[PDB]
Structures are given as C-alpha cells and as structure tokens.
Amino acid sequence: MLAILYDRIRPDERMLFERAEALGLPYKKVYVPALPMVLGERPEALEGVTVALERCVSQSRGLAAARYLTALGIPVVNRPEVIEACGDKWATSVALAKAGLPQPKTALATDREEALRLMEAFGYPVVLKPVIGSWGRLLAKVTDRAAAEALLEHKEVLGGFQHQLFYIQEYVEKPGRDIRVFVVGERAIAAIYRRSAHWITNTARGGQAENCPLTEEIARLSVGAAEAVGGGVVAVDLFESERGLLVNEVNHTMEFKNSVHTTGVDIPGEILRYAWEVARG
Amino acid sequence: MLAILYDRIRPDERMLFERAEALGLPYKKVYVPALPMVLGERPEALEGVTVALERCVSQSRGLAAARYLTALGIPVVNRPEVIEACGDKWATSVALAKAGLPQPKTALATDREEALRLMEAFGYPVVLKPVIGSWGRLLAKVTDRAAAEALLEHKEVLGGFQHQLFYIQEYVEKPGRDIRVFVVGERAIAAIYRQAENCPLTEEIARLSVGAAEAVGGGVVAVDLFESERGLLVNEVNHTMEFKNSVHTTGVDIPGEILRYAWEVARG
Amino acid sequence: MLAILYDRIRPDERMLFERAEALGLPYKKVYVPALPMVLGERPEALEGVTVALERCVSQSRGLAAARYLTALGIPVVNRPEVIEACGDKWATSVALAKAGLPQPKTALATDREEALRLMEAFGYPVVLKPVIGSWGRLLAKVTDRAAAEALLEHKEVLGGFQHQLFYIQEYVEKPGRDIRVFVVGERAIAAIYRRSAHWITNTARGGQAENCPLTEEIARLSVGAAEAVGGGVVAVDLFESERGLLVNEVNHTMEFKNSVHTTGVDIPGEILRYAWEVARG
Amino acid sequence: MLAILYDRIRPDERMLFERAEALGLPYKKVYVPALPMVLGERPEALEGVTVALERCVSQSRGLAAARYLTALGIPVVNRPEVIEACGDKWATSVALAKAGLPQPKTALATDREEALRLMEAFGYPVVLKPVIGSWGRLLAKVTDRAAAEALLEHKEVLGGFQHQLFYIQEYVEKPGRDIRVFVVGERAIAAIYRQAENCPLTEEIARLSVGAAEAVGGGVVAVDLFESERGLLVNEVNHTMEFKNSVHTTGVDIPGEILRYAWEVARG
C-alpha cells in the first residue's frame, strides 16, 4: 500500500489523494505527528505499507520520518539523502558545482568578518540567505554595508547555530520572473514562470504565474540538478541571467496546486506513478 | 599534501602538527574562519593540497568546510556524509539499525503527546536526548511523567525546531562507566573507560566499533559503547575524536594512525 | 465610543460584542495588529474613541496598546500598571506580600546555584515557574534534584533573559481543584471551582468546572489581591491549602466564555458597565 | 544604613565603596546572586539596612532585587517603577509624551506589514530599535524598503516575542555626538558629550533632563539628548548610570551626589 505521510493537509495533498483514487492505487494517509517511530518495531499505521510519499510541511519532521521508513525497509520518495541535500543550501550549491551546473556566484562565510569581506568583494547589491529554511524564509537583498552589518548582527544575536553560517550569493538581475521546473525521475514534466515586481517571486508578494514551455536547455539543466542532489521528485528553480540560465534552488517537497492548471500537466499523477512504479520496485 | 583544517587549536591539533613534523609528512594548517570558500574559485591556501583532515571544534563550520573541499576534488577525513550522519543521533541510530548493530531501544517522536505516550510505554526511568549535539548539555534521565511533561514543553516552547524532534531511549543499567573506542578505517586502534583508564581491545569491542564506524560511512571516528546485561550496545559515533590524554592512557600512537590513514585516503 | 482592542477573536470577545449591543453601548472593535501607534498622532481607528477595553491575547501587544491609549488620553481597562503587575509573577507576588495577603511560600533565584539551593531547602515536590508567561505555560512540578538540574539547564541553554530568573514556590497540596474569582472594581461578581486530576486544573488537561459560591473570605481575598495589583477587572486564582486560602495568580485579561453559564453571572455585562460607567469618567 | 546591591563589581561600584568610606557613611555590599529572596523571610544580609542602591549589571536581576527590597519596606534607588519604565523604550517614550517632553517622532507597530507601512510614511532613513535594551546591539539605521523588510522578518522569525514589538523612530540629523546628563533627584549635576568631553550645564540641558527623569518617576538616572535642528530631543533614560570616567571628565563628585541622595531617600 502507498502511504502519504503528512503533518498539515494542503491543497497539494488533497490532489494527491484524489489522483490516487482515480488511478486505483491502494493508498492511505499517515499523520506523522501521531506516528510512533520505534526502531525495530513497525507501528500499526505502517503495517502493509509498501512505499511512502513524504509530504510533511515541516522538513525536519519529513526527514526524520523518511529516515524511519528506510530503517523499516519501506521505500520513500524522496530518500533522506535527497531531502538532506535539498534542505541545506550550501549542500545543494556544492552538489551543483560538482555536477558542473551553472549557478550564481556563491560563497560561504563562517564568521561575521569573512561575511562582510565577501559582500564587499561581491559588491552591492548582494544576497544573503540562511543555509537552512524554506519558502523564501529570511532572505535578504543587501544594498549597502550598514544593512549588511545590521543583518549579521541580528543573525548572531538572535539566531541559533545554523544562522552562524552565512550564505552569500551574487544578486542576479532577473527579467521580472524566475523559472520553476517539476522533475520526476529523469524527466522534466512541466515548468512555470513566476512573475513579480518583488525580487522574491512567490504568489504572496503580489506575484503571478504562467506556463513555461520546456526547452532543451531548461529540461537538461533541471534534470541534471535533480541528479546532482540524488534524484527523485523535485522542483528546480532557475534564473534567466545575462550569462544564461542559472540553477538557484532544488526543492524536495514540491508544491503544484495551482501549477496543474497553469501547465495542464498531471503533476500529482506523475508523482504517484513514480512512487508506485519505480520507487516501490 | 595534507591540510589540517582547524578553527581553535586544541592540544589534539598540536599533537597532530608535531606528529606530522616528526614523521616528515608535508602539511599545512588551514584556518577555516579565514578560508575563502567561493564555489568555483580554489583559494591560495589550498594550492597543492591532496587530502584534508577536518579538525574544527565547531561541527557546522567543519561540515561546511568539508563540503567545500569535496567540491574541489580534495578527499576529506571525515567525508561530509560521515560528519552529517554522526552529528544527528537519529541519523546515527537509523544507520545502526540498518547495519543490524546492537543499541539501546530508541524512538523518535515529533509531537509532545506522542513523545509522552512513548516514554510511558518505555517505562521510567527513560532517557531524553537532543538529536543535534550540545556538546552534551541537555540530556535528561527522566524518572516520572511530571518531569517528562515539563521537559517536553521546555524543548518545544524554548528550543529551535531542532528541539521539536524528541529522541527517546531506554535507560541502560551499566557499570558506572562507558567505553570509548578509537576507530581508524577498518581497525579499532585503542580504547578507554571513561581518571579515564586504558581499555584493552577485545574481539567484541573491535567488531562492534568497526561495524558502527562502517554503518555511518567509514573513517576516523570515536565509538561509545555501553556494557549492558545484554551485551555491548552502541551509544554514539563521534566524527572528530579527541585523544590528547588517551595517547598517554592507551600508549597508542593515535595521531600517527590518523595521519597514516589520511595519507592512504589521499590516493582517491 | 467604547473601543474593544483585540488581536484574535475568541468566544469571550464575541460575547463582549453581543452584550455591548444589547446594552446600547456605542462601541467598535479595533484590530491592534493593524493599528499605527504614532506618538502625538491619533490614528483613524481611534477617532471618537472615549474608553477602551484591552482584550488582546498577546500580552506584550496588549500592554503596548494600553500604554499608547494612555498617551492619547483615552482611559483603558486595564491600565498598563495593572497589566504589567499581573504579567510578571514576581511583581504579583511582591504586591501580594506588601498587601499582607496569604500566598504559597515564594522565592526568586537569579542563578542556577541559588535556584537549586532553594528547591532543596523547600523540599520536593516544589514548583518552578517562568516569571513571564500565561495560560499555565512552562510550569513544572519538580519532584527530585535531577529533574531540577535538567529543567534549569533547559532554561539556561534554550531560554532568553526572562527565563534566567527562577520563580520557586512551595508545592501546595490542593483538594483536586482550584478557585478562580472574577473581580470587577471593588466587587467579586462570580467564582468557579476548576476541578482536575492534573495539578494544572485547566479545561485542556481533562478538567471540569462548577460554580464556587462567594464566601466572605473568598470575596475579601480576591478584591484585596485585585487592589494589590492596582485594581480594575481581573481574575484572581486561589488555592485551598491546609493552612487556608492562598492567592496564586492575578490575571489581567480574564476569560469567562464558559463561566457565564457555570456561574449564571453576566460577566461580560459587568465588564462593559465598569468600562463605560467608571473607567470612562 | 546603606546597602549597595551588585552582581559584578565595576570601577563605578568601587568608587561608590571608596566614596562611602571617605564620607564615613556606614554601608554594606550585598551580592545579589547569593541574596536569599524568600518573600516573608528577611535575609541576614539585609539586617539594619535602611536604604539600597541598586547597582547590578544585569537589569532583570537588578529589578527583581529592587522589588524584593520594596516588599521589605527598604527604599531602593532606583524604585522598581523607575527601573521598569527606563528599561522599556516604549514605556519611556510614552512617559515622555505624557510629560510633554521633546523627543524624536516615535511609533510602535506590533506587526510586520504595519511596521513597514509606518517606516514608509516616516521616509528613509529611519531608525529601528529593540524595545528592551541590548545593551545597544540591535539598533539599525534603515535606508530602504528591502533592508526594512529583511530586518523586520529577522526580528520576527529569530527573536523572542520581545522582538515582535517594532520601535520605529525618525532619523535625527545631529552633530556626530550626543549629550549624556547625570541627574540626581531634581538636579542635573553634570554632563558629557560622547574621547568623551565635559559638557557644561546650560538651562536647556538642566530643564529637559530633570523633566525626563521626573517623567519616568524620578531618581538617579542618566538622560541622553540629541542636539537637533529643532532643539534638544530626549532619546533615552537609563536607570543605572555609569560614571567612572565622567568623574574625571566633568570634575563633579558623581558618586558623592548619588550617596547623598540615597541618604535622603532613607527617610521614607
């Protein structure tokens, strides 16, 4: 049986339930917060479970649960190695550099002094990001030294250990949008332009979205980024820069609720077929 | 040649510096907080470096630097995968379970009510640990429900989301000491009881320690064992071992063995 | 006009709106998160406002807003002095000691070593509380030295500055319940028994409630506690101990949604009449 | 007689100790972290104490001790009400507004979107402060919306609920210095520019400083002023003044004046 692991039901999960039924896939939902995860002891909720789709909103919960399923010998999409690689921006950027994929100039400082040096060397504006976090949390477009000094002080004084690694990236001049590509295994299945006047292009900051036709370069880059972080089912974010397409981020738990209408592609169905027909083995 | 990555020089790093010199091993010390880590730009400090020993006191700095060196095609001891796995007690316990290695009964909950239900099923006393090292601060032996309830709320309310993962373990009755085993590759080279005394290697200690090291991906690690009534149990695997005193205690050339290992790792 | 200041509408606030209409009181609701609080400049939402009832769930928001209203010369129930005194358990206990009101033995430590000494001197079980917090947050019944050491370590390692003051109180053996008294000015208007098997007697931990008839001692103590913290409209919590009634806590923003049915007393109406007829002047 | 409440002895506290001795003033030093503060049990350390000077470096410890001494009927300099009011910049600004004292244009928001709307209406640059002292860490001069957006999110996401109160203030153009005035009761006794130099008292400095001290409830406080194009503006009022260097800079017996004040406060 397919288990859909979750903590909060979003419309994306509701769509997954609907397609599983329409497809005649034997499935059940598993509420991860109530799941006892004792090593050596399969909990009641997972008896009969033959493959799992990890759909938790909390990535630390999602990752702990993915790890647990691997301990029980149940295949999980995505694998913990993929979730871990996607959940740490430095691990992602390192993986992309190794794969030889194009990305914005990217650097890591482990103290305030190095972080300032780098931002000055990159030149303003420059982007500062937390290494761990999601949904565009705590990103900063830093436009001068005093904004830089103040952000770093807030990270040091208020942030935990994680916020003491400073992820510094060239600010990329985008043409009012970015690209998100939905990758299922070795295929790019669909893509969107996310258009906004705000440098953070999400729906919530006054942004809109349209179909992004797959081009040979968009598909090649996206699938390559997906392979770089360990494969599976992922959303790849790209920027159109002056020097060509750059890979920005890879997301382990992709949202698609509006994008199935935008693209006309059966994204939840592709996800479910991948889990049932390839991950399950 | 070798680079030793460090942030604060401890006596352990000086012994490595002094053993390398004594061995006539070409090496440089690389101060990570000042190392420029720009992807696609090899820094001057890493020119001609063929292997690195990750010796940072900060594990998150150490991991970040290890990843960087892998992007440069420089083998690092330990590999980022090993550091990652050792640094998360749930990742370690899962790897141990998958390798079939003995360990205390262990569970994770992601929610206070389930964590409380689990603690209740384990029975008191039960141990609660943070999943991400402290280095050892927040561990509690919890002896009843009221203590359990309060600690779980404190973790949740006060702690980062990191403290929202509740690592629950059976309390193991044992002889008021632990065994720490120094593993270098496929060999246990030395062990201590922790006034720490030498712990002569046995077949059981050697087999289980190397097994635990392999389970987390292999390398240079310290493995902690419990002497339980049901046998030796793996507690934790540490990615950056301290050995300053244990060189005297065990009479084993721990730093020499580490550097010899790093030299073979240099091959690719 | 009466302004009801709020951040999240609970059933208590809904009842307040209903009684204000039934009473023909000119009133409006003011959503504090959207309220611009510029000193020297009355915002649009407060034009015509003649008295305010502070009903925010967040006590730091509620207090900031109460302070603001005083800067505009608008009477507010409760006054900031009352909110501040009720919101800090040490300030409350100090005020009760000065008033000569009976309370559990209570002490404050400002470091781990003093906190341990006190708990050992009080003897287990002993209660440890944060000085600031509400709705029974972070309370601990501490039953031995190792539970004590572990709680103090979590406070020190994970808590901010506030959690570095340790409020230590004798554990009071209660008869399976505590008393809450609703005080409006110089009158105790109603009271409840809060019954539970859990030492924290709230609804959420499996507790129930019944009418607590007002006795001369219950009324005298409750009104006296109310005066001790600066007066106004407050809920006073008492314990029946072996040495008589003790005052535990005074609450600046009382909840009463179930208690109007339990007691048969028009609690929101009394609150509204106090604000309109006495605080407004 | 006098008790001086302290936690860490700074040069300021030694000068107080040494002035009291020189004055022949009977006093004791009371180490607050070891002071038993049990309500209803006067501790031995406070026997015969008729007034206290609150000199703790930690303001939350200092406030807690001040409250305790008031329960004992011992007058404290400063009173808990004054410490409380000085320690919260929104409480201070509100007290200043109510007293009709000049200050920079100041606003509070409790929500990021409203805070951003306010910053936008003030116009850039604008100052963002934490409401609860740092002692001075987190203050930002914010020069545009992007910087504003990021700082507000960092405060909200990373900070305690204390950082969910957004204290917004007009940026004041001023001559690259501030004035700090030492107020003892109804008198300004000395002032500095802050290589801090003496700032001779004037009528304007004296009037506004004593007014600010009275606005927060009166006592022994340092008042910070801005020399703006529209006059002197009150910035902050500090409940535990430091004066070690300023005794030399101003040539005023600051500690003597503080102790004289404490002696009159002893009367009730």
Ligand SMILES: Nc1ncnc2c1ncn2[C@@H]1O[C@H](COP(=O)(O)OP(=O)(O)NP(=O)(O)O)[C@@H](O)[C@H]1O
């Ligand atoms: N270096 C950069 N230059 C320009 N724009 C950037 C840069 N980094 C991020 N952005 C924008 O900021 C947003 C968030 O990116 P990021 O947080 O790195 O990944 P993400 O969380 O997957 N994206 P989102 O869906 O917005 O949360 C995207 O809309 C990007 O276009």
Ligand SMILES: Nc1ncnc2c1ncn2[C@@H]1O[C@H](COP(=O)(O)OP(=O)(O)NP(=O)(O)O)[C@@H](O)[C@H]1O
């Ligand atoms: N499940 C358990 N049962 C009994 N004792 C335990 C258990 N887990 C840990 N301990 C004990 O807890 C103490 C501290 O354990 P731990 O925190 O894992 O090591 P540590 O103190 O971090 N040592 P180090 O790594 O050198 O800092 C040791 O004495 C262990 O014996």
Ligand SMILES: Nc1ncnc2c1ncn2[C@@H]1O[C@H](COP(=O)(O)OP(=O)(O)NP(=O)(O)O)[C@@H](O)[C@H]1O
């Ligand atoms: N010293 C004590 N001895 C026994 N029980 C106590 C003690 N302190 C608190 N309690 C119980 O714990 C609960 C919370 O008290 P406290 O947090 O101090 O005030 P409160 O938040 O107004 N009450 P609540 O409505 O439960 O949130 C009450 O039900 C009390 O009966």
Ligand SMILES: Nc1ncnc2c1ncn2[C@@H]1O[C@H](COP(=O)(O)OP(=O)(O)NP(=O)(O)O)[C@@H](O)[C@H]1O
């Ligand atoms: N609204 C404002 N406009 C211009 N400058 C300001 C404003 N508020 C504060 N400052 C300046 O900010 C700097 C630090 O201010 P502040 O943090 O209030 O004092 P501080 O650094 O804490 N001094 P201390 O109390 O001795 O630690 C000073 O140089 C002030 O001049």
